[PDB]
Every structure is written in C-alpha cells, then in structure tokens.
Coordinates of C-alpha atoms (C1' of nucleotides) in Angstrom, one line a residue:
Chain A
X985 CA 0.0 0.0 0.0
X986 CA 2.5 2.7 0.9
X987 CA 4.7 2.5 -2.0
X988 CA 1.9 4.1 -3.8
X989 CA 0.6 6.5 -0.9
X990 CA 3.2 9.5 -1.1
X991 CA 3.3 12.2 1.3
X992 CA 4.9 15.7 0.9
X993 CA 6.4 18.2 3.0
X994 CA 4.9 20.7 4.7
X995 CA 4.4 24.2 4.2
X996 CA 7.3 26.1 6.3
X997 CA 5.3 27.9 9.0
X998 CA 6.1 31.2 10.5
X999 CA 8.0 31.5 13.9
X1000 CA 4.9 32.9 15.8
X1001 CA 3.0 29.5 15.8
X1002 CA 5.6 28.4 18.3
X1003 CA 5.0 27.7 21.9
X1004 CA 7.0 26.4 24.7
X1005 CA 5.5 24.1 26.5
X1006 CA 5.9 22.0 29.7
X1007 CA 4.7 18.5 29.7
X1008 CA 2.6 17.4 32.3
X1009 CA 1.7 13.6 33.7
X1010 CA -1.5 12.5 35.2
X1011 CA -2.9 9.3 37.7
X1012 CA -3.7 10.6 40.7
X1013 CA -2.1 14.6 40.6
X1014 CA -1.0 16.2 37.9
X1015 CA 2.7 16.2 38.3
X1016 CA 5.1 18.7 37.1
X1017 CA 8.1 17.0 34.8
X1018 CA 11.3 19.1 33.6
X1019 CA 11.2 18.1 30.1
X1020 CA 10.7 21.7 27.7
X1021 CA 9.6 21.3 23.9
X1022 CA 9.0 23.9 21.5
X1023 CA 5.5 22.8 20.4
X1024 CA 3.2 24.5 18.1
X1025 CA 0.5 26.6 19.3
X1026 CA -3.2 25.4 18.7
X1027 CA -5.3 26.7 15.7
X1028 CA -2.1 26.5 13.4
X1029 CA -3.1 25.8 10.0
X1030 CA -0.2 23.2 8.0
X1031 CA -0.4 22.6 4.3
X1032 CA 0.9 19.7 2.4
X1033 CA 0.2 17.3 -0.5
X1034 CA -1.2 13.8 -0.4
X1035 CA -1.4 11.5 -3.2
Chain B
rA1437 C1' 94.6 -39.9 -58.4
rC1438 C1' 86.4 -40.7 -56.3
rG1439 C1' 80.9 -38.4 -62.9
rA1440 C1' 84.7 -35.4 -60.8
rG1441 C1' 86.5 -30.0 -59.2
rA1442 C1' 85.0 -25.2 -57.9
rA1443 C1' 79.1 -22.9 -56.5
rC1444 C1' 75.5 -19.5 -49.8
rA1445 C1' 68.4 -21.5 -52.5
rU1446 C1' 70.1 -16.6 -52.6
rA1447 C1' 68.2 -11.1 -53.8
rC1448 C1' 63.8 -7.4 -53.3
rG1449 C1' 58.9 -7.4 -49.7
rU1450 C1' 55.5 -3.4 -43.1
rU1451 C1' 51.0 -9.1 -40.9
rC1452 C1' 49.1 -4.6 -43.1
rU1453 C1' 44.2 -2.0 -44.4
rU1454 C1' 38.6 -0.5 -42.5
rU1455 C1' 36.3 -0.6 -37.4
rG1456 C1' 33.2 3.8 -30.6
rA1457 C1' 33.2 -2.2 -25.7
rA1458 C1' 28.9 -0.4 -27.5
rC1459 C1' 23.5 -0.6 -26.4
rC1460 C1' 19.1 -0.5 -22.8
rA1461 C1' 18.9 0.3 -16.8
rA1462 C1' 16.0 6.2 -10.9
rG1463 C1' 20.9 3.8 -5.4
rC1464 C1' 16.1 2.5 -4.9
rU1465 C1' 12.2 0.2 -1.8
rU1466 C1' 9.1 -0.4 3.1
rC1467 C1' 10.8 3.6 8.0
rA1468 C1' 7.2 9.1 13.0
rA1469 C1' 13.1 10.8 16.5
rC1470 C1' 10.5 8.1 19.2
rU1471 C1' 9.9 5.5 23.9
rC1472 C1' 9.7 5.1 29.4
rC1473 C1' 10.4 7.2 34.1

RNA sequence: ACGAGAACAUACGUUCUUUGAACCAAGCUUCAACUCC
C-alpha cells in the first residue's frame, strides 16, 4: 500500500505558531516534569500534498 | 689420383588496411526521533 501512498512536506510555517510548553503527567495529581519542547500553538493551520 | 673439381636457394617485400566495448537500466524500496520514568 505505501509504496503508492506519497506524502509531501509541509508548508514552512512562520515563527509565531511556536510555543514552549511543559509537559505534564496524570494518575492521581497532575505532576510537574522538567522536560521543555517547543511545540506549536493550537489553531495553526499546515499545508501539504497527499497522493 | 672418387661423374669429378669449384658454386650461400640466394636477392627485393610493413601481418598490413577498415572498425566507438557499445547498447538498454532512478541507489532505490518499506521507515514518526521516538519511547519510558
């Protein structure tokens, strides 16, 4: 199947969908965790092509 | 006091002329920078 299903690279975004975040686990309080990633923020639109 | 005695099978002469190791052929295929504290 996925010889035939190629993907393409995306669009290159701007710098202001960026957000740092802090990741964050949860069972019984949500503890804090010192991992930082640079994710994107929500609403952020990403083109690409699909065939 | 030999069908004998003398007498170079020798001289000149390009293994040479013409000719693509070519032709056809994707370094490519499936592949998440992710996982757990």
């Amino acid at each position: 199947v996925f010889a035939h299903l190629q993907v393409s690279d995306s669009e290159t975004i701007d710098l202001e969908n960026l957000k740092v975040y802090q990741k964050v686990d949860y069972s019984k309080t949500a503890k804090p965790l010192p991992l930082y990633r640079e994710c994107l923020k929500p609403n952020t639109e990403i083109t690409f092509t699909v065939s």
